[PDB]
Write a protein that binds this ligand. Structure first.
Ligand SMILES: NC(=O)C1=CN([C@@H]2O[C@H](COP(=O)(O)OP(=O)(O)OC[C@H]3O[C@@H](n4cnc5c(N)ncnc54)[C@H](OP(=O)(O)O)[C@@H]3O)[C@@H](O)[C@H]2O)C=CC1
Ligand SMILES: NC(=O)C1=CN([C@@H]2O[C@H](COP(=O)(O)OP(=O)(O)OC[C@H]3O[C@@H](n4cnc5c(N)ncnc54)[C@H](OP(=O)(O)O)[C@@H]3O)[C@@H](O)[C@H]2O)C=CC1
Ligand SMILES: NC(=O)C1=CN([C@@H]2O[C@H](COP(=O)(O)OP(=O)(O)OC[C@H]3O[C@@H](n4cnc5c(N)ncnc54)[C@H](OP(=O)(O)O)[C@@H]3O)[C@@H](O)[C@H]2O)C=CC1
Ligand code: HEM
Ligand code: HEM
Ligand code: HEM
Ligand SMILES: [Cl-]
Ligand SMILES: [Cl-]
Lengths: 514, 514, 515
């Protein structure tokens, strides 16, 4: 019952201790039960050192929860490569036969800590691979798409899914007012309002990178990729009513399920697959290949196998290793790049920015966040600096010593004299930008790009009749509480997805409005 | 539609705005919808100033939640004095005819920010009165008693009610292991496991100061007091099953109920009453009068009316005025004092300590935390200093200027030359300390002091047959999941409360188990 | 080389020497430390230069709140060696015969901020940590046997008066003297401060003192009162007022640099560790209140008793990580050591950890320099930046059904109900008579010779040589420059109260320099 992740999860852990407790300076604790007073009925004294230390540290246990994805849980495990994808990527963890330790965190989106796992919501599906060339995180979701195509709109969407400023209540009118006024949301809202909005567990859902990313091979050739993590346990979903019943019975149903499964040796597995779009295919694809609200059809780009991952290790300490994990899509490694997906580009900034605040400036030094290789950096100081460089090493580059600089640099000067390095392939090999100016512009318009065609295809060509009916039923449930002003916007929105769906949504909504 | 609290709840509020949005420097925002790129398909530029500002501030929305009592909600209103209690207290807010603005926050204890209002739990009942001699907070609960008599044990109790370190799950075995090994808990556990563990709303419960406090009149004469807030709406409780059903239907049931009631003009009212124990009655009472786990019998000390309070104003902004309120039992005013209740004495330190961290060093300056009178303090600086003293005023006392010093001081020197002020009645007029040394000691033992007699009396003399049966049923439900190691300890604990209760608890537990 | 017993401690958290190329904080290779990525050579900077943003953002977060007070300081590591038998007086492990214990020290000024000169006239901090087998024992002392105040309520007043005016950010002579003359309990320490010892040349050329009365308790539980004295083997060596001010401009880090260089060159500074020991029963009848910080115990009544020595033989590996982030705290006591009814000390026992929780973070105790050598067994958990955590599944509460344990007075299995009592809290201190049964705000118990002026008067009349007496008056009159006309007579009276001849000379010199 060993795990490749054991090295990682044992970092920072004390041995088992017994006898008597100590204060934080190591001195023996007199009592955990009775505080010191000036006479049995006299006042508490200021100098009960343990009392104050115990209370003060208790007072500082809590830290800001994530916004969004506050409610979550995770595990550790292993990635196993079983295919040869070296033609497409030089990324070390993806080379033939590689086995790489991993962490994963699953989550909901809108609710706070302690909110139920089985509220209808997207679920986060966020992986870290502790690779030989650094931590590579694929911070995904249980959906191949998402609600928006521009990060500028992300805080609007998340406030609309959270609580009204006046009274701290979540609100149907607000959710639908936003969604109908941001019709790019239709693809993901259709997915969310279906059966997959309420998966039973974290084990019984697929995961996806959602965004288009780039793979680059040893020769520098790029291809566009999408990640699919296909559950070996299978999709398994509650109905709307079932999900609510479970929310009241066990708000931590999914957290408990994953813990139990691993504790019992029932290790969940996902097959890792990719869609691969040749660089030359992108401009002419029927949909914009970088628009997050557009999936690539699997009839055009079938899933290609890479390997599998398995979760075989529960955390040693939930707070230290899961609450404090700092999963970040900007944690890329050689052989992997980004794309002109504006949502992705905003994310590459946003996660580390939040983590610097939520955890601290030195969050990268915490056991679960350190890579397996040594970090060679000129960064220094900051709050709670546990790790520091070898004595006397330089704080600046270029310098006259040997600590070094970037791989493009010579290590000895500032690259003046008009030195150029060229295309920043490590970010991504870019396609045509279609303009020479700083602009605020639409995405390049491809033949079938609109806000409604893909969820309409889902409804008309993929869903069975039971799925179609449950979708309409779920939507009409989610509509209860909207204002009269919002009603026709919602009718119009669903009509635009499909006129039969829209008709049925309105029919059921009106029956329930009573 | 007016409230005395209007002055307070309007502090910090912007006027209604329209037109277009602005950045935080006041410059016009170009778009809330589209971010700037270098070409339509080019990379996002670093200098989309609004994008980064919007994302970065979004990233910092969350702050540490309270530990404990994270999940709560509140309102504002008025305290009205209707009786003359000036013979007992000189406290300004309690003088005849006085009408004082108030805030209140209600809460659960164990769960985090998103957790259901209707989990079985104690409910917090925390009041601020914005008096002419400062903010006076009575930070109470919906129970006249509590689980412990020494603050040293408080973090143990709260960890036992929260989540296991390994897996983030709450745990029955942990809750009962602590409760039965800390049998002082029996009084409150009996109250908690009865109907009152699941009140339907915040309006349908009493509130209590719980601790013994002190009242001092204009002549300096002290009496011991306990606060009772008697609901005019009446106690109204869910069954165990009903509370869980509601948790799944609406995790914010009580928050929503209070908001709706006030919005609809159905203003909830509580009658404010006190028990008053003469200073000379304390040593000879059948129970220790300062032990939080001991209530004063209302047969011995009947409720004496003081006035009523009414909640007639919802917050303008929930986060700003409720999440950020810093309710603190150390917020006492002239005419009110403490007592040798060790729990109370620990609390007088603990709340401000947490608030300095949870909110910030300058939390007292936030609109909802400022008193109505001007604060004259030598404190200065700290993070986010909004309010500062008049230009050039001195930073130290004693000084040669006019800002002043304490009311006991002369305003000109340091009170050297062996100056004494005598008894610190503003803290409390103390009873005998029963010793001359710094000690860790039991409370003074009164005739009927033990851990079990009071809940036994509740069971044997107060509860009706349905209440007694539901109590046993609730306990046996809450026991599901305890280890075989814990079972006999729990059987014994309940037998100590009452032999018939204990027998029924074991009977129902064994029926439900396996 | 030169080994140190402190090597274990100072090596904690240190990376090996690295070469080749730099990496981002996720471990991926850095393309450039020189050029940022743009959309075309003359195009805009792109958002997704991940290294650029990470480098700038972590740079932006390098600074942390400096200490208030004692912001400007520096330190080293070394060894405590016991050479005498004091076991009849204390059971404290580090003080037992033959014991060798690793140590840290930080020296400092008081009023100035992080960038301010080491040689401004000021008290100097002398703060020791001993990494003992029974926990970290810190003696957070100063280079004076006394201090300005006898009640912690007044401490923030004194420190604001030594810092900057609220309106304009300037330090101010009038404010300093207005406070001192209105708080005449300050006279003892101000006399010490204004003499030669206000300007020691280096950290090595000054004594250290615990200042407060502490308590020692032996194996049988018998207490004695003690004061610590750390007697420099290098000897007191002081600048004049003029010399110190010149050095302040020439090298603001004169003392920091001196200590670094001394240790690098193998010139390890040493102090002899001694105590005054006052029998418990002597306390009530001493001519001065033995718990009043403004009162020293005469060495004629209580001579210095030798204990051992300490030596500084190791420079820090990283100044910020090991010195700026050290959390020295007088509340870090160990078995065999206790407190006393010195109200300044009692306030300090609260204040340091309180500031450190803010200045560093909730989990500051887990940083390499702050961890003891023994394992910490605590039910505390979580908090920001939790690096260290308990063994998997260990309980978070006591009493519990497992083995993690509780306090040494507890039984480990219940809450000590049923009216359990443990008795006198000797680990805090064996208390003397409290002289009352009520919560009060009261003077200290008045001993025969207690006043605010006799002790500095004795220093002036019986201890100082003629040169010291004259330089004292000259230094005081220099420090008075800038006081208001209102403050002048207060200062004249204050010095007259110390000694009429000193007062006359102070006024003479002050008026010569004013006009
Ligand atoms: N292309 C993609 O990456 C994905 C697309 N979709 C949706 O399917 C539509 C067609 O895509 P395309 O790949 O061309 O067609 P395909 O028929 O090849 O794929 C349809 C996909 O939809 C999934 N699916 C089945 N039931 C549901 C449901 N209740 N809710 C959400 N998804 C479900 C299928 O999973 P299964 O094989 O287990 O039946 C399958 O992955 C798209 O418009 C999109 O909305 C959904 C998931 C992935
Ligand atoms: N003394 C006090 O301040 C209080 C005591 N108690 C409990 O009552 C016992 C007797 O106290 P005493 O004042 O001498 O006797 P009393 O008969 O005068 O008061 C009994 C109290 O118990 C309340 N009560 C009724 N049902 C329940 C229940 N389901 N769960 C919890 N409380 C309930 C009553 O409320 P109501 O009048 O509305 O029926 C009343 O306030 C105590 O041992 C204590 O456990 C409870 C509340 C306050
Ligand atoms: N009792 C104590 O713990 C100390 C007292 N003092 C001062 O000395 C006075 C007499 O104390 P007592 O112990 O009875 O007499 P002692 O003669 O036994 O001791 C006098 C002390 O004063 C020190 N001293 C010498 N020059 C100066 C100076 N320039 N500035 C400050 N201190 C100096 C001496 O150091 P050295 O032996 O090297 O000459 C010695 O430690 C006290 O009122 C106090 O002000 C000062 C330091 C410690
Ligand atoms: C521009 C759009 C988005 C922005 C700005 C954004 C930003 C953030 C931030 C700041 C966090 C908190 C990170 C932390 O504090 O550790 C977060 C959490 C998370 N986000 Fe996003 N997000 C966006 C869209 C997405 C998308 C499209 C996905 C999936 C493809 C996603 C998946 C997740 C997941 C899984 C988490 C939780 C990670 C964990 O378990 O720790 N987000 N997001
Ligand atoms: C020694 C025992 C206790 C300690 C150390 C303690 C400490 C605390 C702390 C630190 C907070 C968070 C405050 C904040 O961050 O704003 C809190 C919340 C709270 N406590 Fe306690 N507590 C104790 C027992 C009690 C008792 C006996 C009562 C009732 C009589 C009580 C009622 C409350 C309430 C109502 C809140 C939430 C206040 C709000 O709504 O903001 N606590 N407690
Ligand atoms: C009631 C009076 C006093 C209070 C409230 C007080 C409080 C403090 C605080 C809060 C710090 C900053 C600690 C940190 O953040 O690490 C500090 C620094 C310091 N204090 Fe005090 N102090 C008092 C009097 C004294 C006395 C009498 C002495 C010496 C006997 C002393 C010696 C020091 C030293 C040496 C430092 C710097 C420690 C270091 O180098 O890190 N203080 N003081
Ligand atoms: Cl920040
Ligand atoms: Cl803090």
């Amino acid at each position: 019952e060993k795990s490749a992740a054991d090295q990682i999860v044992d970092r920072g852990m004390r041995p088992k201790l017994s006898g008597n407790t100590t204060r934080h300076n190591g001195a023996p604790v007199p009592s955990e039960n009775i505080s010191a007073t000036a006479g049995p009925q006299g006042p508490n004294v200021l100098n009960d050192i343990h009392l104050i230390e115990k209370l003060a540290h208790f007072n500082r246990e809590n830290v800001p929860e994530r916004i969004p994805h506050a409610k979550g849980h995770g595990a550790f495990g292993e990635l196993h490569i079983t295919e040869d994808v070296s033609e497409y990527t030089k990324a070390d963890l993806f080379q033939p036969g590689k086995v790489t330790p991993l962490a994963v965190r699953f989550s909901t989106v809108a609710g706070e800590q302690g909110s139920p796992d089985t509220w209808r919501d997207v679920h986060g599906f966020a992986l870290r691979f502790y690779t030989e060339e650094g931590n590579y995180d694929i911070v995904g979701n249980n959906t191949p798409t998402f609600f928006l195509r521009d990060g500028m709109k992300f805080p609007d969407f998340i406030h609309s899914q959270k609580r009204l400023n006046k009274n701290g209540l979540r609100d149907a009118d607000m959710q639908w007012d936003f969604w109908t006024r941001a019709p790019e949301s239709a693809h993901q809202v259709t997915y969310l309002m279906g059966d997959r909005g309420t998966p039973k567990t974290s084990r019984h859902q697929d995961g996806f990178g959602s965004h288009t990313f780039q793979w680059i091979n040893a020769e520098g050739k790029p291809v566009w990729v999408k990640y699919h993590f296909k559950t070996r346990q299978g999709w398994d979903c509650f109905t709307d009513a079932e999900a609510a019943k479970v929310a009241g019975e066990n708000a931590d149903y999914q957290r408990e399920d994953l813990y139990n499964a691993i504790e019992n040796g029932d290790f969940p597995i996902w097959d890792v697959k990719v869609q691969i779009m040749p660089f030359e295919d992108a401009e002419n694809y029927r949909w914009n290949p970088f628009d997050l609200t557009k999936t690539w059809s699997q009839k055009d780009y079938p899933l290609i196998p890479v390997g599998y991952f398995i979760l075989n290790r529960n955390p040693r300490n939930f707070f230290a290793q899961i609450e404090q994990i700092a999963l970040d899509p900007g944690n890329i490694v050689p052989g992997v790049g980004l794309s002109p997906d504006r949502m992705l580009q905003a994310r590459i900034f946003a996660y580390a920015d939040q983590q610097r605040y939520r955890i601290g400036a030195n969050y990268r030094d915490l056991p679960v966040n350190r890579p397996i290789n040594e970090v060679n950096t000129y960064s220094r100081e900051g709050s709670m600096q546990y790790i520091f460089d070898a004595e006397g090493e330089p704080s600046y580059s270029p310098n006259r010593y040997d600590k070094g600089a970037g791989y493009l640099d010579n290590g000895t000067d500032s690259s003046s004299n008009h030195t150029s390095y060229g295309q920043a392939d490590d970010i991504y090999v870019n396609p045509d930008p279609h303009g020479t100016d700083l602009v605020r512009a639409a995405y390049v318009k491809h033949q079938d790009d609109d806000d409604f065609i893909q969820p309409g295809i889902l409804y008309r060509e993929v869903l069975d009749e039971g799925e179609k009916e449950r979708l309409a039923d779920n939507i009409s449930n989610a509509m209860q509480g909207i204002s009269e002003a919002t009603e026709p916007r919602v009718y119009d929105y669903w009509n635009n997805v499909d006129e039969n769906l829209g008709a049925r949504v309105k029919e059921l909504y009106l029956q329930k409005k009573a």
